[PDB]
Design an enzyme around this catalytic site. Structure first.
Site, short mmCIF file in Angstrom:
data_model
loop_
_atom_site.label_atom_id
_atom_site.label_comp_id
_atom_site.label_asym_id
_atom_site.label_seq_id
_atom_site.Cartn_x
_atom_site.Cartn_y
_atom_site.Cartn_z
N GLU D 49 0.90 -1.16 0.00
CA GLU D 49 0.00 0.00 0.00
C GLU D 49 0.93 1.20 0.00
OE1 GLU D 49 -4.18 0.48 0.72
OE2 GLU D 49 -2.95 -0.05 -0.98
N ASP D 60 -6.27 11.36 7.63
CA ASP D 60 -5.04 10.93 8.19
C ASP D 60 -4.72 11.61 9.47
OD1 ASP D 60 -3.40 9.00 6.41
OD2 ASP D 60 -3.95 10.49 4.96
N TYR D 175 -11.40 -3.43 1.52
CA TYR D 175 -10.68 -2.77 2.60
C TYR D 175 -11.69 -2.75 3.72
CZ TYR D 175 -7.33 0.15 5.00
OH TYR D 175 -6.35 0.58 5.88
O1 G3P Z 1 -4.38 3.22 10.64
P1 G3P Z 1 -2.88 2.89 10.15
O2 G3P Z 1 -2.16 3.60 11.09
O3 G3P Z 1 -2.52 1.38 10.13
O4 G3P Z 1 -2.60 3.57 8.66
C1 G3P Z 1 -3.77 3.39 7.47
C2 G3P Z 1 -3.02 3.41 6.07
O5 G3P Z 1 -2.19 2.16 5.81
C3 G3P Z 1 -3.54 3.41 4.98
O6 G3P Z 1 -4.57 2.38 4.49
#
Ligand code: G3P
Ligand code: PLS
Ligand code: PLS
Ligand code: G3P
Ligand code: NA
Ligand code: NA
EC number: 4.2.1.20
Lengths: 262, 389, 389, 262
Positions: D49, D60, D175
């Protein structure tokens, strides 16, 4: 009441205008205030205008306002004013002394009770700076009963009925204003009409600092000039050298009074 | 004079002789204006379409919880400028113009009359000078910048306590000198007649609107109307239409400052004696010798050692009752209006509010319909109330 | 969905899948509320009796001198809180409560939506968090203290430009995490459907009142209604009732910042290209690579690099025209409203005003009836405009 | 498209769950990013990814946000991302690489034009983080025409019709979300129903940092776990000692992948 008639008769007599100094009672301390007053009489003063220090001088510019604060810092109350007023009457029994007041200080102890203390101490007239003719009745009836002359102001914008009322109720002298404003050392049909109505001697008031204004005033028909801030400014100026103060004061008064021949 | 200058023994025209024809010019102007339909009409248009009036009467949802008290507020805080102040000033600027005058002198303590004097001078085209005490210039500065951006001049009085008394003084000192060109836009229903009568008449819409409004919402008149009292204008604007309805009590709230007992307060009418200053005979705070005293309050618009005469009279005959509120009690009612009603009140209006809460929480089972005059917003106050931490 | 999310190609629901049922819950809630007479009734009561509405329509006396332009202002500055902002927030807090929610997240740039979000949460009893960019926290601080005194929490976003974009971002980041308990009170007619439709419907009283008012004063509808455009709410609140009266033009004013040509501005709709960010497809300011750009304006409520979708559509079919105004031209119209009309406007509303003056003084003999939406007061701005000396 | 089928067949085969690392393309500089990616493949990575750095990462948390800023400071654009994507496909032709994107970067050059550049470079799937199922049609029709698997997210609050739509339109893997929120390294009926509907292999997503979460996931029915922030935190942590970074990364991946036996 009478010391004025006296002065005006003897002045008319020897054909000259009157010269009335102003000082705030107690500035810059009682001891030096009394000596300033003797030196003023010494140098040429025909009568005296005296102030009792008020907190809020509604009709006064800054020289007099600071004078009041000097007095207040020297610890001067209305009672110390009356007790020093009797000590200077005790040694100068001829001179007319007039008190220039604000209404709260007259009204405080009882209006009539004020006039009685004045009489008792040897005061000739009371000018209340903030009581107009139309509000004077309590004040003018109580000073008449204690033989103190009620002094009233004649303003440059005075009309028919006002010159009539001032002529009727007034005594001592008519305080004739020079200008609009508050007391500061800077910048005929009325005199005629006042005499027609038989108003007592017009003494001219705000803003005389120059001898030629005195001469001018007398020449115009004013029985004398009153000067205030001009004098206080020399007290302020020379607070550090009392000797030179009394000395500069003397000089000032004699010059100012010299100007009164007319 | 065409109108009476005395409210029982209180009142009068204790001025320097030189200002008397001016006061007489004004009383005539006022009587002419009040009958002039063309004056009435445009006083109205600017009250409605420019100031934003009728002001609303808001019912309190949350502060009365678990009490039998219903509490409405009269929202003078929603008035153009941010305070009751603006209604009077529009009538008076119009009077100044009717009389061919062109400068405006005014004095300010909370800055709200200063700001309202600048906004009407800019609207009606008059030049404007404002005196304001140096301590109020600091503790009320939002209102300073607002005045200068509208082109008014504010002058800092440092004498005395450097508070409204000291600004009133310099304001009257200049008007004696300028009365030809300049009108003096007096701050409250205080000073020389005709000002006690003019300020009331130009503020009675406040209560004429509340009476109408409450009658529509409740079908009955309040049990009490409450308002704070520094000089007396919002209180008399509120009380005026209610005076002949004997059922409606009227309460007025003075600054208790640090507590009456400390000396540091501003409560003349209930803890001072009659005196003569600023053109009137009214209760005053003074020394034993008649020297006028400096007052104290956390709020600049209430920091004033005398009270206008009609309040002195309504007290005396027992038709209105006057009470005080401490600094701390006014801060508590500010914090509570903010957080449970989402209105920041002025610290002045909080003294009136804090009394109504005291009335409610002392007798919680008493069924009572109250109305508080929320006279201004607390925007001038937020920097100051927030350094009280 | 029960309602259309697109204004021609503009609009949509470009969210993370997890927030979609939430947006769907809201659209249902909205449709239910709009037909619920009991909802309508108390939305009304709080608009009238608490916010202070109808707002007034003021004729300008002095700024139009020697021009054939009549200029009325719509006084949203006289609205409880100090800006148009308050009308929408009352409807939306009521929707939040109807849906059993109890926290409120909101984002703020000028602080005015923050303050309005704190006042309605305190009134209706909801807990409230607000994101605000660190630069707007400084240049708009009066509005900060006002929020905290009403018990709201404001959180300083330092990321990016530390401005509204950056607050929108942290606000959506938290709501994805909190959507169960928390409603997101969005600032403008921007973002994800149903918010473009809800904010407009909860702001169309602005124009429904102007249309009525002008018709009473002038007997005819305006020649143009002008409003500034950062995200789009006051403009669409104003434009909405006028859209089917083809005679009335509608102008919208974007921040020209330091001048379009410097890059430093906030004028997406006329100098950006369609993009997808913050839940919508709308004109945007971006690099060649599709990275979203930081905007600039002297005014925090207009410093935002996209524009709500219905504005993008009314532009495209040619029913509304959009123009810009520089920092300096907005400062000039502020200084002029203060000094000749005695109203301090917000620097946001000054961009709309400065265009109407430009319209007037460029063609002084043109007979034209204009209306500017004075959307807020300049109280948040007085400290900042005064260090521009 | 196929490299996934391949991986899932060979993984089902040797009965183990899949382990998919996440890294932002270009952090902390292109040169070290490519080596991190080789070491990740080296240590145990079943597929990849990868993120293309966006200005405004709407979904994020902070580790990834700072990662983006490190990338941006290293001067990484979308074009440098595609040119480094082809260099790592040029030496690891088996591994499925999926791109995790934000809609403005797909939409910028023309949506279809994006998918074509992906195809051209050797990319297997594109996850657009901010386009919900109901908005996917332009994006899912253009990736199908360029044989890139459209990846869709299944959220914990998914309903009947949504699991149906995700099952129909999705490809590659579904996902599967762990929690609400944004990507951060902290804190069954759906898997069943997805398989009933014939949705491609559920890989579990947000917040795995611990090996026992991997085992747990696989055991639960998830065909593997995705871990992102956990890994980026070691890039951040060891930015000063690149050697020790690559070394700590290796260790982390092999442990994480070891946990995939079930
Ligand atoms: O929630 P994390 O920290 O495992 O990060 C999510 C990203 O890999 C993106 O799908
Ligand atoms: C909101 C508010 N409410 C009430 C008052 C008190 O005055 P009032 O007694 O006249 O009604 C003030 C004072 N206003 C005067 C005096 O300081 C001013 O110059 O600003 C005020 O600011
Ligand atoms: C008085 C005034 N008028 C207008 C606007 C601009 O927004 P609008 O485009 O939505 O109508 C703002 C912004 N208000 C928002 C965004 O920064 C706030 O959070 O404070 C404003 O403060
Ligand atoms: O105006 P001045 O300065 O002469 O002072 C006035 C006082 O003497 C008091 O009458
Ligand atoms: Na008082
Ligand atoms: Na914008």
């Amino acid at each position: 009441m009478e010391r004025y008639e006296n002065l005006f008769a003897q002045l008319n007599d020897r054909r000259e205008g009157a010269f009335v100094p102003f000082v705030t009672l107690g500035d810059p301390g009682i001891e030096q205030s009394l000596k300033i007053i003797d030196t003023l009489i010494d140098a040429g003063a025909d009568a005296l205008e005296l102030g009792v220090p008020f907190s809020d001088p509604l009709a006064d510019g800054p020289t007099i306002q600071n004078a009041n604060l000097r007095a207040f810092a020297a610890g001067v109350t209305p009672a110390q004013c009356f007790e020093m007023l009797a000590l200077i009457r005790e040694k100068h029994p001829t001179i007319p002394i007039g008190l220039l007041m604000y209404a709260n200080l007259v009204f405080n102890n009882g209006i009539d009770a004020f006039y009685a203390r004045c009489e008792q101490v040897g005061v000739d007239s009371v000018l209340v700076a903030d009581v107009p003719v139309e509000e004077s009745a309590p004040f003018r009836q109580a000073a008449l009963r204690h033989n103190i002359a009620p002094i009233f102001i004649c303003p440059p914008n005075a009309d028919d009925d006002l010159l009539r009322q001032v002529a009727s109720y007034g005594r001592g002298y008519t305080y004739l204003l020079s200008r609009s404003g508050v007391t500061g050392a800077e910048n005929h049909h009325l005199i005629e009409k006042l005499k027609e109505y038989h108003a007592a001697p017009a003494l001219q008031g705000f803003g005389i600092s120059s001898p030629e204004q005195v001469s001018a005033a007398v020449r115009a028909g004013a029985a004398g000039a009153i000067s205030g801030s001009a004098i206080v400014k020399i007290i302020e100026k020379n607070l550090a050298s009392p000797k030179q103060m009394l000395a500069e004061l003397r000089s000032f008064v004699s010059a100012m009074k010299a100007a009164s021949r007319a | 004079t065409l109108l009476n200058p005395y409210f029982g023994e209180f009142g009068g025209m204790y001025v320097p002789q030189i200002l008397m024809p001016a006061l007489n010019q004004l009383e005539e102007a006022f009587v002419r204006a009040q009958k002039d339909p063309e004056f009435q009409a445009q006083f109205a248009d600017l009250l409605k379409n420019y100031a934003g009036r009728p002001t609303a009467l808001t019912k309190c949802q949350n502060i009365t919880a678990g009490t039998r008290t219903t509490l409405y507020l009269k929202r003078e805080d929603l008035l153009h400028g941010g305070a009751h102040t603006t209604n009077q000033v529009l009538g008076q600027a119009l009077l100044a113009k009717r009389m061919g005058k062109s400068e405006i002198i005014a004095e300010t303590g909370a800055g709200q009359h200063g700001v309202a004097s600048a906004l009407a001078s800019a609207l009606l085209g008059l030049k404007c000078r404002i005196y304001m005490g140096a301590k109020d210039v600091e503790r009320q500065s939002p209102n300073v910048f607002r005045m200068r951006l509208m082109g008014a001049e504010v002058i800092p009085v440092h004498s005395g306590s450097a508070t409204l008394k000291d600004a009133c003084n310099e304001a009257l000192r200049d008007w004696s000198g300028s009365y030809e060109t300049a009108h003096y836009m007096l701050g409250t229903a205080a000073g020389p007649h005709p000002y006690p009568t003019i300020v009331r008449e130009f503020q009675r819409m406040i209560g004429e609107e509340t009476k109408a409004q409450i009658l529509d919402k409740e079908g009955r008149l309040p049990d009490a109307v409450i308002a704070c009292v520094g000089g007396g204008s919002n209180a008399i604007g509120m009380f005026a239409d209610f005076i002949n309805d004997t059922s409606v009590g009227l309460i007025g709230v003075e600054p208790g400052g640090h507590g009456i007992e400390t000396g540091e307060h501003g409560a003349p009418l209930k803890h001072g004696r009659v005196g003569i200053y600023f053109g009137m005979k009214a209760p005053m705070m003074q020394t034993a010798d008649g020297q006028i005293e400096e007052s104290y309050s956390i709020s600049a618009g209430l920091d004033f050692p005398s009270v206008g005469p009609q309040h002195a009279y309504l007290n005396s005959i027992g038709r209105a009752d006057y009470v005080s509120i401490t600094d701390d009690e006014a801060l508590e009612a500010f914090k509570t209006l903010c957080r449970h009603e989402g209105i920041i009140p002025a610290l002045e209006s909080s003294h009136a509010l804090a009394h109504a809460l005291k009335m409610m929480r002392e007798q919680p089972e008493k069924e009572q319909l109250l109305v508080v005059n929320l006279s201004g917003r607390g925007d001038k106050d937020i920097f100051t109330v927030h350094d009280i931490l």
